[PDB]
Nucleic acid binder design. Structure first.
Ligand SMILES: [K+]
Ligand SMILES: [Mn+2]
Ligand SMILES: [Mn+2]
Ligand SMILES: [Zn+2]
Lengths: 341, 618, 117
DNA sequence: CACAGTGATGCAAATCAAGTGTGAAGCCAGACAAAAACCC
DNA sequence: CGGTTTTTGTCTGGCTTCACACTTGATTTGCATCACTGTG
DNA sequence: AATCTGGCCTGTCTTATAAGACAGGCCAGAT
């Protein structure tokens, strides 16, 4: 795990907390710019390529049949296998939460310039309320595909929300949401095991199971050291969801997850306490029926990272994380690093 | 022993010296005034004084024989504090020193002024909304509220880098009306109406919002805020009452652009260009305002409940802010108007014939068109179709023209034409940057010799005021060789000075009716002058504000009656108070500066306190 | 004060007058005349020597409606008179010893709004 | 060891308001005499 | 060093006017307190 | 060999002294 400083181009300002990175065939792309898209890049999506520790953000264009989604902070993002990306929830530049779901897919790749398709998927049934800071993952059970969505936050409901606390947020009800992309329906399951609301947790999905790690529960204000397994069965009848608590769970909120090899992932970053960053890193080894969380060697953090109050980042995909910490102000607002594995 | 002065002697000693004149006066009293020596000496002294032009002593002695005590009511003291700009800590020094030299407590101590304040600030008077306001709390004791409005600040969330405080929109308006109460009563009286008449009043409110630069950050613990502030203010413009089938102008602001009547509603330390934080702070304000569009405020004035209906007009915005909050592109764009769909090129070819088509409603539609792309169009075609509306509006403004910013950007254009006329660009197309720099230097030196104008870095209100005269064109003409172009300049400025009073005066219909009449005629020759004798600059392009000024001024005038009174200039002049108050009238610490300024800025805008200063001039 | 010889003279004359005429109220402007004539060389020596003794003596000397307690107090005043500083001590002790003061405070509550307006 | 503020807070500290005979102080009256400055 | 010119008082009974008596629970004031300001 | 791209730059543009919009030259890399 080698840490590396990164320089940024003229449009460094776009990069903010809550941004997202998507991987299409090794080419990384960037989404969720600060402010609304400007005439320099109307889509708000950028080809994000670091060459010799210098990052250039270059505008990407959309297909004629694309939606022009708003920039979204803290959406639930997922990869679908023909490779495509799911974006659900998030905050808009106007601080609204969007219930809409967008699918990002490569339309054309002529001469190493990529056109994207951004289509909106309508959702009926038990649609999850607008959310940020929540996870969405795709499971495979008995030759069937199903989407799972758990946790997060939203504003108070229209009946109780008052302008004096207009921005107050509360954890969504911790209902697991099965979401079939083929039909556009969503099914809600209440479980006894998932009693508290949870946001900014990590989600790792293998076959028919999704693990829920860390996170923060607003009511309790606790970053619980619990691990939750959620198994989904896809028989010919209505699917069934079973949850199991498994002790030995990490205590971290807003952690970042990257895949080093098949069936092994690294969990870095995030916070153990409001004022205490989580400097340690954990290695997760998956078994068809078992999950293994191991302490691993901490990286050689610089004195900036050690003493920053906040840090943010996302996974670039090839087992390399892109990190950002608040920088000096007159200069550039943020300082960026790339940690490889 | 030489006779001392009579005033030095002891009582017993001055008695001996006047006992010869004392017995002489007792006689005069019994013979003439019935032995009332007290009254005859009191009058002989008082008259002796005024004989030596010493009226003050005599007048005070009069007031002390009458014996009436002297002292200012706290609410009087508050008005003197608020309106003479004194700080409490300076006022306390005055108060203290007055009480110790006169022995009398002429001014009241601070705790009482601080009690008088309570009436004039939001949260004090009770009210109610029928129907109740949507998503608003119905508490009526809500003064200064935290401007983040419960914004989430845990370390997982988006970083909170601003401080803000505000009043709740209604509770503010209420305290606004109650300030105007005495002025509202008289407005019915001088309209020959019943004082106690309580019909459905209507309050038209001007809304204003600006961003400020160069707001120094305090040391000390707190959010690492930016060095910019944002202000949201409202002015009460007119109150009409419905008496029969007439709308009776009970009240109309005499000075619509004065710092005095602009009311502070929201102070934040934040950058207007930072959309994320701007919407976060102001969205609770726009919801409270939305709610009040569909309710009537029942409020009790002088023992009689009255009802008020509210019309909100956002017109104290500059073009850059308008374009930000209504989802339009920035102002380089080819979509140059915020009032119409015209394109920069088109505005240069047609110039005058364009009607007001944009609106907060339409943009909101167009954004949703943008985001959804229903005709599965290309992004050029999409943008054409939505005429550049490519973000989601979040504040509703009037489609209008700010006069101040209109006056400014126009003069700066003329300042440029002046330069390009010195360099004879009308004849010689190309010129080096060094050649241009000296045209500006020439003109700058000359505006100093002839017009006493020192050069300034950014264009001014007053500079524009004083540059856009015909005397200045005389000045600038001395520099240009050809008198065929002295004529073009002179006419261009004549047309502009015939037009200007329309879009700057409070009531053009009353104040320059002929200029309002001819506006469509003069604006056509101005446009044609630019199109012929100024091809070099205005072929294929025109400035945003030349378009607004040449195409939409008459329509706006007939829709609203005025442009000049809905200008942001009152808001701008309020900024001057922001700066002064933040230094000299607020606790000097990161967690108090914003509320202390908000509060004490409100008092400075209280007509009830202002009246006490005009009390001499009955 | 320090007394001159003539002043001791006048004081002694006043004493003689009071012992000769006990029921008699002297006039001042006439008494000054008659004393001044009596003063205007051996009689006066006694007073002259008395005055220096008085000088030595001078040397030595050189070196809004009312509180509920007020409403209660005013009524109980006549009984204490039957029984100012002493009266108020008694009034305060008995008031302190006393739902007892709820009615006087209700009267004061009615009077508080009237003071305010 | 710069220095005079920037406004709200909250705890001393002082004032209030009433009940009414206490002595203390200044005062008037006429006439005259102490003291304390000025005219060789 | 008196001669001479003004301050200052005595003497007295009784005239007014006033503050001072003490207590109790509120109001109204006085004042130090906090962490920062700007001119460099 | 040519062309048409499309990105990068500088400059001037609103409006307005720090940015965003836009045009147009400049040249390398495809059709
Ligand atoms: K002004
Ligand atoms: Mn502005
Ligand atoms: Mn401004
Ligand atoms: Zn227009």
């Amino acid at each position: 795990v080698s840490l590396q400083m990164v320089t940024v181009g003229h449009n460094i300002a776009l990069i903010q907390p809550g941004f997202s990175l998507m991987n299409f065939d090794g080419q990384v792309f960037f989404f969720g710019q600060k402010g609304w898209p400007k005439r320099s890049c109307p889509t708000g999506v950028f080809h994000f390529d670091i060459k010799q520790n210098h990052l250039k953000l270059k505008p990407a264009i959309f297909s004629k049949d694309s939606c022009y989604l708003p920039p979204l902070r803290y959406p639930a993002t997922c990869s679908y296998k023909k490779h495509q990306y799911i974006i659900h929830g998030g905050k808009t530049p106007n601080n609204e939460l969007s219930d809409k779901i967008y699918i990002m897919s490569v339309a054309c790749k002529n001469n190493k310039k990529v056109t994207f398709r951004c289509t909106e998927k309508d959702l009926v049934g038990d649609v999850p309320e607008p959310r940020y800071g929540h996870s969405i993952d795709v499971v495979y059970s008995r030759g069937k595909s199903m989407g799972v969505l758990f946790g997060g936050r939203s504003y108070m409901p229209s009946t109780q929300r008052t302008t004096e606390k207009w921005n107050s947020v509360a954890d969504c009800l911790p209902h697991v949401f099965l979401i079939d992309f083929e039909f556009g329906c969503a099914t809600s399951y209440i479980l006894p095991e998932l009693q508290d609301g949870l946001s900014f947790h990590v989600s790792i999905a293998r076959n028919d199971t999704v693990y829920i790690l860390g996170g923060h529960s607003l009511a309790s204000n606790i970053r619980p050291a619990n691990l939750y397994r959620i198994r989904v069965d896809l028989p010919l009848g209505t699917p069934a969801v079973n949850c199991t608590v498994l002790p030995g769970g990490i205590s971290v909120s807003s952690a970042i997850l990257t895949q080093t090899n098949n069936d092994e992932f690294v969990i870095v970053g995030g916070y153990q306490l409001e004022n205490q960053k989580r400097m340690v890193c954990s290695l997760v080894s998956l078994g068809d029926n078992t999950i293994e969380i191991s302490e691993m060697e901490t990286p050689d953090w610089t004195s900036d990272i050690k003493h920053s109050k906040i840090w943010f980042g996302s996974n670039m995909g090839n087992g390399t994380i892109f990190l950002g910490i608040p920088g000096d102000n007159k200069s550039e607002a943020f300082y960026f690093y790339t940690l490889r594995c | 022993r030489p006779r001392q002065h009579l005033l030095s002697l002891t009582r017993r000693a001055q008695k001996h010296r006047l006992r010869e004149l004392k017995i002489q006066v007792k006689e005069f009293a019994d013979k003439e005034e019935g032995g009332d020596v007290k009254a005859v000496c009191l009058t002989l002294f008082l008259l002796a004084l005024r004989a030596r032009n010493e009226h003050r002593q005599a007048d005070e002695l009069e007031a002390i024989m009458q014996g009436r005590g002297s002292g200012l009511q706290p609410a009087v003291c508050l008005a003197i504090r608020v309106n003479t700009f004194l700080s409490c800590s300076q006022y306390h020094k005055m108060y203290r020193t007055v009480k110790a030299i006169t022995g009398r407590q002429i001014f009241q101590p601070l705790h009482a002024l601080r009690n008088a304040e309570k009436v004039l600030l939001p949260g004090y008077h009770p009210f109610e909304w029928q129907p109740p306001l949507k998503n608003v709390s119905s508490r009526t004791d809500v003064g200064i509220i935290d401007g983040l409005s419960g914004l989430a600040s845990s370390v997982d969330e988006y970083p909170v880098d601003t401080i803000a405080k505000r009043f709740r929109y209604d509770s503010a308006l209420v305290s606004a009306l109650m300030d105007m109460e005495e002025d509202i009563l008289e407005g019915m009286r001088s309209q020959d109406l019943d004082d106690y008449l309580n019909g459905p009043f209507t309050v038209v409110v001007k809304e204003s919002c600006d961003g400020m630069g160069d707001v120094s950050e305090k040391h000390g613990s707190g959010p690492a805020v930016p060095e910019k502030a944002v202000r949201f203010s409202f002015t009460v413009m007119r109150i009409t009452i419905e008496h029969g089938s007439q709308n009776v102008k009970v009240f109309e602001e005499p000075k619509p652009n004065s710092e005095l009547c602009c009311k502070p509603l929201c102070l934040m330390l934040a950058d207007e260009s930072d959309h994320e934080t701007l919407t976060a702070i102001l969205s609770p304000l726009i919801a409270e305002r939305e709610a009040m569009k569909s309710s009537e405020l029942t409020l009790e004035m002088g023992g009689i409940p009255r009802t008020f209906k509210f019309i909100f007009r956002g017109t104290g915005y500059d073009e850059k802010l308008v374009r930000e909050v209504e989802g339009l592109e920035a102002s380089g764009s080819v979509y140059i108007c915020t009032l119409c769909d015209t394109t920069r090129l088109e505005a240069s070819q047609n110039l005058v014939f364009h009607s007001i088509t944009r609106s907060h409603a339409e943009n909101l539609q167009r954004y949703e068109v943008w985001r959804s792309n229903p005709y599965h169009e290309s992004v050029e075609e999409l943008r054409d179709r939505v005429k550049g509306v490519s973000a989601k509006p979040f504040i509703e403004t009037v489609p209008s023209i700010d006069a101040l910013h209109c006056d400014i950007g126009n003069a700066a254009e003329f300042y440029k034409i002046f330069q390009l006329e010195i360099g004879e660009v009308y004849k010689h197309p190309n010129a080096s940057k060094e050649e241009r720099k000296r045209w500006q230097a020439t003109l700058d030196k000359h505006l100093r010799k002839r017009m006493n104008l020192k050069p300034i870095m950014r264009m001014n209100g007053n500079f524009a005021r004083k540059l856009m005269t015909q005397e200045t064109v005389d000045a600038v003409c001395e520099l240009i060789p050809s008198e065929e172009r002295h004529e073009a300049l002179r006419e261009l400025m004549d047309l502009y000075l015939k037009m200007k009073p329309v879009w700057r005066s409070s009531c053009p219909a009353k104040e320059c009716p002929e200029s309002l009449c001819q506006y469509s005629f003069n604006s056509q020759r101005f446009a044609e002058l630019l199109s012929t004798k100024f091809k070099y600059r205005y072929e294929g392009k025109i400035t945003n504000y030349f378009h607004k000024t040449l195409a939409h001024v008459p329509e706006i005038i007939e829709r609203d009656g005025s442009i000049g009174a809905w200008a942001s200039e009152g808001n701008e002049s309020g900024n001057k108070l922001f700066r002064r108050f933040r230094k000299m009238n607020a606790r000097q610490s990161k967690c108090y500066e914003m509320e202390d300024v908000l509060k004490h800025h409100w008092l400075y805008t209280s007509k009830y306190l202002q009246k006490f200063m005009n009390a001499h001039n009955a | 004060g320090k007394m001159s010889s003539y002043a001791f003279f006048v004081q002694t004359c006043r004493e003689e007058h009071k012992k000769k005429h006990p029921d008699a109220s002297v006039n001042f402007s006439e008494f000054s005349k008659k004393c001044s004539e009596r003063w205007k060389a051996k009689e006066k020596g006694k007073f002259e020597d008395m005055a220096k003794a008085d000088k030595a003596r001078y040397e030595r000397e050189m070196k809004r409606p009312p509180s509920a307690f007020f409403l209660f107090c005013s009524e109980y005043r006549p009984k204490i008179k039957g029984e100012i500083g002493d009266v108020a001590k008694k009034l305060g002790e008995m008031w302190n010893n006393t739902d007892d003061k709820q009615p006087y405070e209700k009267k004061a509550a009615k009077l508080k709004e009237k003071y305010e307006k």
